[PDB]
Design a protein around this ligand. Sequence first.
Ligand SMILES: OC[C@@H]1[C@@H](O)[C@H](O)[C@H]2[C@H](O)[C@@H](O[C@H]3O[C@H](CO)[C@@H](O)[C@H](O)[C@H]3O)CN21
Ligand SMILES: OC[C@@H]1[C@@H](O)[C@H](O)[C@H]2[C@H](O)[C@@H](O[C@H]3O[C@H](CO)[C@@H](O)[C@H](O)[C@H]3O)CN21
Lengths: 500, 504
Amino acid sequence: QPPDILLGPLFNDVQNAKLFPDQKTFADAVPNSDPLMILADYRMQQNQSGFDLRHFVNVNFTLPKEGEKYVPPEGQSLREHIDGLWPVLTRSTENTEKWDSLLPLPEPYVVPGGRFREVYYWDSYFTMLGLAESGHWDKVADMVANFAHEIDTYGHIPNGNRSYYLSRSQPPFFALMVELLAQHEGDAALKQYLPQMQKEYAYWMDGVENLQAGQQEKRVVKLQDGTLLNRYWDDRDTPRPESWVEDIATAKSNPNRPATEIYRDLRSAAASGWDFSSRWMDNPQQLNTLRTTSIVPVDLNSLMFKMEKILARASKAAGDNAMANQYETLANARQKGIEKYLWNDQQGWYADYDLKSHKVRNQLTAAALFPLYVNAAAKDRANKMATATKTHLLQPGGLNTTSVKSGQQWDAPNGWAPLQWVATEGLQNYGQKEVAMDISWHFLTNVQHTYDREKKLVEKYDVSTTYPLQDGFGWTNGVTLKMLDLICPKEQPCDNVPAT
Amino acid sequence: VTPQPPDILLGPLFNDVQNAKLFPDQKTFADAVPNSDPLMILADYRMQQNQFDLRHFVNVNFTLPKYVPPEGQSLREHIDGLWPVLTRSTENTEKWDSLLPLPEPYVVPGGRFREVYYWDSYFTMLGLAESGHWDKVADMVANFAHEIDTYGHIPNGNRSYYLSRSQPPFFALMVELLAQHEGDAALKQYLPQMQKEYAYWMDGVENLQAGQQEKRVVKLQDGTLLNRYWDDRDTPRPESWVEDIATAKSNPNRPATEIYRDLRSAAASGWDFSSRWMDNPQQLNTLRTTSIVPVDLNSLMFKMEKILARASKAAGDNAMANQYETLANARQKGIEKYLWNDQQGWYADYDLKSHKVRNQLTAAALFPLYVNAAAKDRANKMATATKTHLLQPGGLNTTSVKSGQQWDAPNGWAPLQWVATEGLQNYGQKEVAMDISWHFLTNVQHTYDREKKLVEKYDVSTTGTGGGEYPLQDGFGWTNGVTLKMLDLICPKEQPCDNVPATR
Ligand SMILES: OC[C@@H]1[C@@H](O)[C@H](O)[C@H]2[C@H](O)[C@@H](O[C@H]3O[C@H](CO)[C@@H](O)[C@H](O)[C@H]3O)CN21
Ligand SMILES: OC[C@@H]1[C@@H](O)[C@H](O)[C@H]2[C@H](O)[C@@H](O[C@H]3O[C@H](CO)[C@@H](O)[C@H](O)[C@H]3O)CN21
């Protein structure tokens, strides 16, 4: 149960009082006794002469640790810095105290770094690429097994292993994780995790059998002509426990709209990974105008395509050819849907589909490379995507997330490792090597420059040239390894990005 | 972890079994127990579809759910003898079972209702208490406290598919019932759980802006705080799967999620279904439950606030007692202003769409008298309105609208008979209170005499029994409890009756 439900008005009071400078801190606090009895105790004590809320919290909760700082040794190469960090980013939480928001996992896992003290769904894929690249297949397998277990226990992979992340998933990479493990383990891996891949697919498509044309429900939309696509959705319609005061302030700033609708769209953008972006906003100046759930995402639907293709491949590997064909049929239908509703023929680029206006959007964002990444894109449209990339999103320090400098995280001038890799790999898929290399060199140069000065890798980079900023950093480390390998000869690998 | 509801657990397999109507009751497969991990059952299902007999597949992979009274019992004896028959003890359940474990024995309503029910349990516990079974009463209070502890609220019943909603809140009244036997020990003991339940009903209230609603709370333009019925999910009910899909399918121009939310929220109200929630009582696809502020729910919330004040005082916190008292006072004002119809002269629900008190008189209108929130003059008008519009030869009518739905004319339901009787008695309206009691009891006795059963509800217009999508069920928990209480009321304390007298 998430902390706001467990603790009631007590959670609200502590978050609003801003006892801790991060709202995630009290979301991660561990009750020392039954939260129902803490709430009862709080109600009695709170109006007592001299009641101190900070003292009450200290007495009734164990808080996250806060004073510590990682100190790398001097002058290690970029590659050695990353490679030696894996144990540091690894957590082992097979059992948790009762009432901890942290959810137990059977095997060790890598977390992104800093305040992100839990496994993240889509981060873990790019992280696992790094682990695999540097020969840590056992950690890769541990993490696949963990996610399989979450599917088994919760019915889906939560955004992270926190009670307050249970209400949503994230960009789905599990099937791609199984394929990554199969690179090492062969078809055995596809066979072992077929039931879990199927159950995750059931999650995303839940309710589709009874969904009528022109309606949406949970993570599924059916257009008027019957086309089936997915959207991001969270099952709750309240402030995020981890961003409690920010979300309340957002909704309060637009009393013309039901707060429940704003909370739903804030939580659904968090499910998208892109919390937040002009991509979801009617007005980039005002977060209270986001309408995430009314938007059909081109990246999510690309990922669904890949999931359907992988289900077909795993079915075939298990010896069920008829079932493999069924998944191929679903994949083809998805591909047609992407090509019809998620391609903007006037601009010549992929884009989201707007359910309110019943048209494909004009806005170009880095999500538009996803159809290339998953091999859904027609060849001529992949070529158009290379042009659009160079014209609009390629910047000196890497691939821009969007061309709108809104002040939000998933927008210009911010470059995010996962997006760099998806773009690089999708362009390579279609022989657009020049643009793919430009992204890799520009982003890697940006990573090296920050590492040179600060001896760290961080969650995101400003591409204009080459909560506070977080360090580690899981997906940055993974993508860097992969790109470093790409830009230097296989037989003469580099440990730092060449100056020229 | 608590299993997800059966539709989530089994993915499309559930949908397929329900739609195929392999079983004549939709509830039957909702209560099926998987013989292995549903994730693996679903994988097998998809494989076996590509290589098939659904019924046989279900037979292999699930275990499906499975009385002759003694000779010559009086009505009272039959009821007292039935308590063990209706008792279940489920401290441990199988993995993947939709049945949720409870630490103590519990009485269930009867028939297809093979689990404990929230509001039924109060009326049932009145019967248990009346006939000396205080141990069972304490068991059931403990079970509900445990559910609040474990889930954060009391679900509609102990089934995974009921977890997304509660029911008309009687827990605080159950605690007061135990307190009648134990003294205030019961209040002190269950104060934390009574507080946790209030937090559930009021969840989100601190941040709710005027003119908006969220979950179970509404805040009107002037800041007035009231509650509504709500279910956290927006899909067909597993236990009524094909019926609910048909309902939504019948108006494809309204988002199906709204219709599902309103169907589920009417089941949260206990009154699934009623003209009360519907724009047109003849058409179920017009229900709009979550836009209606219910007078019965808010009466019960008033009572909860009152008991919380009493319990707080028992625990020695007068400051907290005073706070609950202030909340109760605000609720009373809210009831008198927004849930009383002065045109008609009766309590009624408030409509959030038209921003007006509703004109319909239903049995829910007696709740303010039951909980002692009503002004004396208004209680007197309610007595007249009851006598004029709702009193029928076989008991108190649920509404005066014969819609074809269960919570409407000509159906009479035990809990509503008792609430009306007690409400009227609280304001000295003895004549109407005794009329309800004598009429309902005569109905119950007549059916008992010929059919040797008590059932879920009665025809108050014709007397006898027999809307609804499942057959009339027997037992029957709340009917038996209310019958005992009313039997005691209508005969002298010192010369009690075992059958309802044929002559007043
Ligand atoms: O690197 C961790 C996560 C990543 O998964 C996500 O795309 C990116 C996002 O900017 C942040 O999201 C996390 O934090 C939020 C609170 O700050 C949560 O509400 C959100 O659910 C969670 O994924 C940091 N990022
Ligand atoms: O006596 C058991 C229940 C009682 O709690 C409720 O008021 C009345 C209602 O008419 C039926 O409700 C139950 O069954 C439905 C399915 O037939 C469920 O959807 C509902 O959630 C459940 O309370 C029988 N009654």
